[PDB]
């Protein structure tokens, strides 16, 4: 079982370093060295979300390293987990929005010539962030540190602090974690995947039927992006659904391989925030030219 732990630690380390670096350079180049367009604004929002998430990896590393102890305080746990959840939701929603934008540009050229502007992009990019805040309100409302009797302290969900016995808190936790898992599997996974799939399928269908001078490059890049997103995110969502179906039995320690699968797939899910800068900004030639121009 030591193989899982060492691979998870290595993934966390490489993700932290490479994602922080890549997203920092993307933010620097797109936000300062270039004139803002709709595409640059969308990529800047994606980079900001990815960087602000990846900066918090060492907290996960030191929590797993100490076996689960949270050496920090109440406020720091609340803050870091609010940031983590907001940035993950914002990342997935912005990916879906970028896919939809590309689909609309390809399928309706006349509409984008008349209505696709920087002011409209500024108004539109508010949606994902507000949705992330609305979905993250539970983590800022109910998460707190609790002491484990072995002398440890771990910070997790406290849905029912007003009662002490396990008899009611178990039921309350089951109901709340169930609704949380349903909201997660629907909003965070099914909608973005459906949007990306439909958008890129429509783009491929049009670009292959109506005919262009060449079609290898757009299809290859679209397939890379969609496959990377699916591979990075799907296993974590499916294992989390399996967990939240049997969440009640998990709390009493009768299921452990489920937890280990969750904490292994979490690293793969987080790796997408490191893969995003390459696949979305450095598959374009001009951005690479500006990057090499900088030194």
């Amino acid at each position: 079982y030591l193989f899982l732990d060492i691979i998870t630690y290595l993934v966390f380390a490489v993700t932290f370093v490479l994602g922080v670096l890549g997203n920092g350079l993307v933010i620097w180049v797109a936000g300062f060295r270039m004139t803002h367009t709709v595409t640059t604004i969308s990529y800047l929002n994606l980079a900001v979300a990815d960087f602000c998430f990846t900066s918090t990896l060492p907290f996960f590393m030191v929590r797993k390293a100490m076996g689960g102890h949270w050496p920090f305080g109440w406020f720091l746990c609340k803050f870091v987990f609010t940031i983590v959840d907001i940035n993950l939701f914002g990342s997935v929603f912005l990916i879906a929005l970028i896919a939809l934008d590309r689909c609309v540009c390809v399928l309706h050229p006349v509409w984008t010539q008349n209505h696709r502007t920087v002011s409209l992009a500024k108004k539109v990019i508010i949606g994902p962030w507000v949705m992330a805040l609305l979905l993250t309100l539970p983590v800022i409302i109910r998460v707190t540190t609790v002491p484990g009797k072995t002398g440890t302290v771990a910070c997790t969900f406290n849905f029912s602090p007003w009662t002490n016995d396990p008899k009611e808190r178990i039921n309350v936790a089951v109901a709340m974690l169930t609704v949380r898992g349903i909201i997660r599997f629907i909003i965070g996974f099914s909608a973005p995947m459906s949007i990306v799939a439909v958008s890129y399928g429509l783009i491929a269908t049009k670009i292959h039927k109506q005919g262009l001078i060449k079609s290898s490059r757009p299809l290859r890049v679209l397939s890379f992006v969609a496959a990377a997103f699916f591979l990075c995110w799907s296993p974590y969502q499916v294992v989390a659904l399996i967990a939240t179906v049997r969440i009640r039995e998990l709390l009493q320690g009768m299921y452990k391989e489920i937890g280990i699968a969750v904490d292994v797939t979490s690293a793969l899910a987080f790796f997408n925030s490191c893969l995003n800068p390459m696949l979305y900004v450095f598959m374009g030639q001009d951005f690479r030219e500006r990057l090499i121009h900088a030194l």
């Binding site: 983590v84 959840d85 997790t156």
Partner: peptide, 4 residues
């Protein structure tokens, strides 16, 4: 998203 996170599974605490």
């Amino acid at each position: 998203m996170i599974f605490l």
